[PDB]
Design a protein around this nucleic acid. Structure first.
Lengths: 213, 216
RNA sequence: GGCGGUGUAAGUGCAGCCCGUCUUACACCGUGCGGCACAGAAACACUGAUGUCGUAUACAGGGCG
């Protein structure tokens, strides 16, 4: 089985940068290498075939090269619509093998989150569980930290986070954090706070509500 | 001109069986190699199987040999992937793909189906509960809680509201059920004039809910 | 083409001469097989050309001054 070792596994580059992605074949694959671009939730799109030929309709800023068993995908100048995950593929021998992918994200200025907090709904409180939700909207870079406090007591192990993909129109991320509590615990305590640490903030920001406001 | 439409995905228990279909138009599948390629959620592309023109020779990934069969129906211009004895690690979006014409695009896969999701798991189907996230520019949203399997779809105001919307990826809770939120930010003045309704569809359980989100 | 068969000639184991064998040339007759290139809607298989680079019995000695 021929291996295709692709590097780097991710990279963040500014608009206008030249980016180079490398794929090394564990053994000779002649020139039977293709490159694909994949956007989240979409099928891959063919960019390069036979190691170095540009597929019909692909912009001239994409190119491919082969030196022996080393293959290279180059974007001469990165455009904002080029954020995606790129894959090499060898089709010299069966089983066919893909490289592991290079996720390309767009560099951008630091932007602090706008933070919102949502109490549980009355409908949910009929059910025995309470979910408190903290939204961090349109920040960059992706790394962010959320801590929950209930009446000043730090919570652990009762929250989960999820992050969107980079936005195509402003290159930011958003994050939602959900605190899961029993209905009884939620109805007993008063002050619910979400504390957010992020590079766009010099010190952490707290957004909170009082139950029943 | 070329279209590839897949179907047959869904949820089965470990050890179960499904058959995926890839219905082609714009070209006769007899004169191309047809491939299946899968992608586990959050992971890379993995080649599964292929069938050659003229010979009908078939090829398989090591992980699927003996369990999967790729085939083609010339009279329906349709290719198939029969999947038997399914395992948890077969959970993935499955794509069919046309290998292009040799003199035009080498061995590159030039057309791809839209993808069909296969989930292998013992957990039972369950539709979600949908709760409002009452308006806090204002933020508002819906919490879509306790469903299985993936996916849910969320739109706002039957698709008329798209700008400023963030539908987050689902997180698996310790209960084994999924949960997500969908939020949107709007000008605060619009809270007085525009009704905000989140439309949630959970096709795997035939659960479909529209939830009005109003100020608390 | 390469290989093989047959025929003709010349050269060729010696101190020397002769026959053979061996080699080369020419003539005619049989006759291939691989690998790698290419194309056919074409990775394998299948069909079709044309190139190239390669291949195949390790039976020779005797007579007379």
């Amino acid at each position: 089985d021929i291996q295709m070792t692709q590097s780097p596994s991710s990279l963040s580059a500014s608009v206008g940068d030249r980016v180079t992605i490398t794929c090394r074949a564990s053994q000779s694959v002649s020139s039977a290498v293709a490159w694909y671009q994949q956007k989240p939730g979409k099928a891959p799109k063919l960019l390069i075939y036979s190691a170095s030929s540009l597929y019909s309709g692909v912009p001239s800023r994409f190119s491919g090269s082969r030196s022996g068993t080393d293959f290279t995908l180059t974007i001469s100048s990165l455009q904002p619509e080029d954020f995606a995950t790129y894959y090499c593929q060898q089709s010299y021998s069966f089983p066919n093998t893909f490289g592991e992918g290079t996720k390309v994200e767009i560099k951008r200025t630091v932007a602090a989150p706008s933070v919102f907090i949502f109490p549980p709904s009355d409908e949910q409180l009929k059910s025995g569980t309470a979910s408190v939700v903290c939204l961090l909207n349109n920040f960059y870079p992706r790394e962010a930290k959320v801590q929950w406090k209930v009446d000043n007591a730090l919570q652990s192990g009762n929250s989960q986070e999820s992050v969107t993909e980079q936005d195509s129109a402003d290159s930011t991320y958003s994050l939602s954090s959900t605190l899961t509590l029993s209905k009884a615990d939620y109805e007993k305590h008063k002050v619910y706070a979400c504390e957010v640490t992020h590079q766009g903030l010099s010190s952490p920001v707290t957004k909170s509500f009082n139950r029943g406001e | 001109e070329v279209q590839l439409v897949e179907s047959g995905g869904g949820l089965v228990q470990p050890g179960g069986s499904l058959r995926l279909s890839c219905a082609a138009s714009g070209f006769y599948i007899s004169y191309s190699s047809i491939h299946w390629v899968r992608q586990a959620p959050g992971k890379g592309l993995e080649w599964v199987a292929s069938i050659s023109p003229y010979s009908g020779s078939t090829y398989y990934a090591d992980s699927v040999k003996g369990r999967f069969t790729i085939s083609a129906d010339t009279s329906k211009n349709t290719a198939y992937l029969q999947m038997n004895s399914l395992r948890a690690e077969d959970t993935a979006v499955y794509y069919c793909a046309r290998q292009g014409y040799r003199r035009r695009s080498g061995r590159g896969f030039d057309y791809w189906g839209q993808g069909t999701l296969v989930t292998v798991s013992s957990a039972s189907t369950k539709g979600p509960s949908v709760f409002p996230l009452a308006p806090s520019t204002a933020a508002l949203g819906c919490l879509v809680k306790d469903y299985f399997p993936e996916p849910v779809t969320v739109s706002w105001n039957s698709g008329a509201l798209t700008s400023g919307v963030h539908t987050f990826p689902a997180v698996l809770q310790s209960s084994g059920l999924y949960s997500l939120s969908s939020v949107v930010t709007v000008p605060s003045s619009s809270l007085g004039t525009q009704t905000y309704i989140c439309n949630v569809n959970h096709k795997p359980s035939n659960t479909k809910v529209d939830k009005k989100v109003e100020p608390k």
